C-alpha cells in the first residue's frame, strides 16, 4: 500500500474510462492536466480513496472543466465548468506546439513577412510562446499563443542560431485565427550555425580524459520499498511525481534513536518563471511559467545510465496521462543514488593525541526536463548530518534574437549579429513544514551589531535577534545578506534536551528577485517572485504561488490572495514558500550550448538534535 | 629547472648553513618563518637566482631579524633588525605552545585560582593564545601569550568539554614571567565529556553504509612534471606551498587553441582571522589570525588515502623548516585528484531531434590544517568550462566557555552548563591577476532596474552597469547582494572575436563581513575584513592584507596603508583581495565535534573565450 505511492498505468486508464463513460471525454476534449490528489489532513485511520484531479480542455472552445475522480469507486466526485476569462486559461498542450507554425504558414501577412526576408516557409520554425495579459482587448476570453520565428537550414540544424527578429505573430489556437502579425523591421538573420555536434564547431575531440569508475560492490545503502518509499542513513521519505511539479518529496523524517521525527511534510518546486528584460515589442511580453503554463514534469527526460546518472543508480519510471487519457511511462525519469561528499568532520587534537576523520555522503533524487530551448535538472539532496538541500541546474540553448547595430542595454551579443536577451529564471519552493509535527512557526534571524560602550568596552561584541512571524500579513519577507538573515522553522511545543524549541534554519542564496517594474503585468502575475520568503497557513487548495490556471490570468492569484486572509501562523500548520532565482546576462561562453549554472537553498538542523547526529558514522 | 618548483630539503639546509655561516643562527636563534621568494617581475628573464626569506626569533630577547639569502650564491642578500614594539612580533612558535601551561603551573596566583575551584593543576591544559594589542602598558616590548584553561580528566579526554571560565592569565614567554592572572569568579566547569570516539556518546556504530568504490583504471587525466607542475584538460599551473599561507597556486593558465592564456599569476589565502564576539573580559581580547599569527602551513596534516582523500590521488610532500633550520617533510600534505562533477551541458531539441549530454569534471588541489581546537580544509578547484573556485571547509571542536545561568546574548549553549561564544572565521584571498597577461582592470557590475515609461512601456526592462575602478582610493568595495553585484577583471588590450575586452567574473557568497565596532582593536588590526573587495597595484613587498608581522601588531600596515598610495589600476598589473567569511552561532549539532561548514568564492569566464570552450569534450 502506502497512500503516497506513484500513479500506476492502471489508475490513469481508470480515470480515462470513468471520464469517458460519464460523457466528459468526447472527441473534442483533451487532458490538459492530470495528477493524484494528496491525502487530506488527519484522515489517517481511513483506507485509501485514490482520487485524481483533471483539467479538461475543449478544442471547440465550449467550456473546459476541472474534474475530480475517485479511482477506487469508479466515479466522478465533481466536475466544475471553467470560466477561463475569469480564472485563467488551461495549460498549454504538447499538441498545440505545432499549431502556431501551421496556422501561420498560410497567413498572407506571415508569408509576406517571410518573403520580404527571403525565407522559405518550409524552413521556418515557430516557437509556441505563452501570451500573458497586456493591452490587447480582443484577447480576453480568447486562448492565445504567440509565435517567434527561427530558421532551420536542414533537418538536424539548431534553429536557435537563426532567429528572425522584428517579427511576431499572435494566434487563437481554438478559433484557428491569426489575430495579429507585427513586423517592426527586417533584421538580418544571424548567419553562423550553432551546431555543437558539428566537427567544424567542436574541432578535434579531446582524447585526454581518462575514465572514472564509480561502483558499489555490495549495492547502495538505501532501500526502496512500496515502489517509492526510501530509507537511507536514518532518513525516511516518499518520492512522488506530478506532471506539473515534477518530483515532489513527501513525509521527510529522520530516525533519532527510537522515534521517526518528521521534518517536512511535502516539498516541491511549485512554480518557476522566466521573465525577459528586453523592451523591444517583439519580446517585451515574454514570461514563461514553465511549471504553471507548460508543466515541467510532462517533458521529463529518460536518463541514460553512465551519462545522465553515473554510479549505482535506482530508477523510478513515473507514468503520466497523454492528451487522450492514455498512460505514458517516462522510462528512467527519476534517478536515485548516494554519493561520497568529502569530509564530514575532522579533528587532530594537540592534548589527547587522537586523530579523527569521518566522510560525508548525500542521497540524491533528481530528474531533468526540457521546455523548448531550456533544459533544467532538479536535484534534492539529503546529507548525513540532517541537512536538506535543493538545487536547480539550468542548461540548454539560450533564447536568441538579433543583436542590433550599435548595441543594446538589454541584450548580449553571442556571435556576429546574434543576440541573447537578458532574463531571469525564478523558482518557488513550497515547503509544507512539519518540524517534529505540524505545530510550527517561523522566525526571522538577523545578525545584530553592537556599539562599543558599557557592556562592550572593547567593541568586539555581536549578537543576533529572532522575530516570530505571527500572522500572514507580516510574513512576506525579503532577504538581507548584509545582516546574514535566515529563517528558522521551529516547533514551540517540542523542546531539545537544553529545553529549546527544536528547529531547521533555511539558508538562501540571496540572489536578486524579480527585476521588473512593480507596475508591470509580470510583477502582478508572478508576485511570488518579488519577495524571497512567504509563510502561509496550510490549506488544501492553496497549491501554487501563482494559482491553478496561470495561462493568461490578469494578476494577484496565489500567494498575494492567500496572504490577504491574514491567518494565525504562530504555532500552526504552516507552509513556507521560498523564492530563488538566476539573473542571466548571457555570455559568449553560453553559446552555442550553455554550461550548467546553478541556484538553490538549504535547510540545516538548528537545535533539532541533542548533539551531533553523526557520532555513529564509522571510519 | 622550474623557477616555480617547491622548496627542497637541501634548499632548507642550505639556508640554515648560510645563516649559520653569517653569524645569524647561533644557539639562541629560531626560525619563526621561512619561505621561498617568488621571482620579481620580468624575471626568469632577469637572473634566476633562488632566494629565501626568513624571520629569525631570538630566545634571549635581543631584536629578531628578517633576512633574505640566495641559496645558489650562498650569500646573505639583506638582513634587518626588527623593532617588534613598532612593526609587530614574530609568528608564535610551535615550541612556545607548552610554555604558557608550564610557567602557570608554578605561579602562586594561578595555583590559588585553581584551588578555589577544586582543580588538580596536573589536569589543567592551558591554550596558548595570541595576545593582540589592548590596554596593557607592561606589554609594550614584550612577547606575550594569553592562556585559557580546560580540564582534561585523563590522557585521551577532550579538554574542550571542560572550560574553566572566569580565569585568564598573561605570560611573557621570553622573560618567563606571568604578568597578570585575572579571576572574575568561580564558574562551574561543565561536567559532560565530549569524547566523540567513546561508545557512551557514539552509541553502536551504523552498519548500514555500503562502500563506494572510486577508481581510475587507466590512471588520472592530469600529469605532474618538474615535481609540482600540473596540466589537466587545458589547464596549466604550478602548485606551491608556503609555511604561512599553505597551498599557493602559480601561473594559472588555460590552453585555448595554440596559445597558453594566463588568467591568474598567483592565488593564495593571504590571511584568515577568527574574531570572538563575547564581551566577557575572559574572552573579549580573542582574535586568532591562524594564517598571520600561527602559520597554517606548519600544521598541514598528513592526509590518508581513503579517509582524507578518496579516489586516485597524487600527493605532494612539501618541505618546511623546523624552528632550528632543519628540513621537515610534510608527508602527503597536499592531495591532487580529478573528480566527476555531474552534468556540464545538456539539450534535447524539439526541432532537430538531437539529444546531447556532456559531464563536467574538476581538478582538486587541497590540504587540511589543525590550529588548536581548529581544523580547516583549503580546496582549489578548476572546472572544464574555465571556472576557478576556492572552498574553505571549517570543522574541529568549537571553542567553549561556561554557559551563564540566566543565558547570554553572545554565547550558545551546547550541553548543560557548556557555552560556545559567537565568532566569525574570515578569510582573505589574494589574487594576483593576469587576465590574458598583466594589463588588467576591475569593473564593478551591478544589475540596473528600469522604470516603466517611454522606451520601456511594459515595465519589464532590466539592464546592468559597469564601473571601472581607476585608482586604489576608489577600489575598496562592498558586496551588494540585492543588485547582484559582481566584479569583472578584464584586459582592455585583449579583445574576443566580438571586439569586447576578455574577462573573468568574481562571484562572492555575500556573507557578513567583520561585525566588530569600527573603533575596536580588531577592526583596525583586521581592517581588510571590514570590506568585501579591494584592488591594489602589484608591488613586491605587498604580500599580506595584514602586513608581515601580525602578532601583537597595531594597525598601520597592510591593505589600508597600500591603498593610500592611490596608484593607477586601470589597465595595469593588479591584485584583487577578496574578503569572505562564516558567521558562526554555534548550535547543539556542532557539539562535541563539528560537521563541516563551507564558504568560498569563484571566478567564471566572462567573454574570455569566443564561444563555449567545452564543445570538444567527448561523450
Ligand atoms: Cu538563462
Ligand atoms: Cu566557528
Ligand atoms: Na505544515
Ligand atoms: Na597582476
Residue numbers in the entry:
A (entry chain A), B (entry chain B): 9 to 627
Kindly provide excerpts from the paper associated with this entry:
Copper amine oxidases (EC 1.4.3.6) (CAOs) catalyze the oxidative deamination of primary amines to their corresponding aldehydes with the concomitant production of hydrogen peroxide and ammonia. In their active sites these enzymes contain a copper ion and a redox-active organic cofactor, 2,4,5-trihydroxyphenylalanine quinone (topaquinone, TPQox), which is a quinone cofactor that is covalently linked to the polypeptide chain. We have studied the CAO phenylethylamine oxidase from the Gram-positive bacterium Arthrobacter globiformis (AGAO). AGAO is a homodimer comprised of two subunits, each of which consists of 638 amino acid residues and has a molecular weight of about 70 kDa.
To elucidate the mechanism of the reductive half-reaction, an attempt was made to trap the reaction intermediates in order to analyze their structures. The reaction proceeded within the crystals when AGAO crystals were soaked in a PEA solution and freeze-trapped in liquid nitrogen. The reaction stage of each crystal was confirmed by single-crystal microspectrometry, before X-ray diffraction measurements were made of four reaction intermediates. We determined four crystal structures for the catalytic reaction intermediates of AGAO. Based on the spectra of the crystals with deconvoluted absorptions, we found that the wavelength of the maximum absorption spectrum of the crystal soaked in PEA for 2 min was close to 352 nm, consistent with that of TPQssb. Two peaks, 436 and 466 nm, arose with the passage of time; peaks at 60 min, similar to 120 min, were 436 and 466 nm, which were consistent with those of TPQsq. These results suggested that AGAO in crystals reacted with PEA during the time course from 2 to 60 min. We concluded that the product Schiff-base (TPQpsb) was formed as a result of fitting models for TPQssb and TPQpsb to the electron density map. We also found conformational changes of the amino acid residues in the active site, Phe105, and Leu358′ of a neighboring subunit that moved as a cap for the substrate channel. In this study the rate of the catalytic reaction of AGAO in crystals was 6.0 × 104 times slower than that in solution.
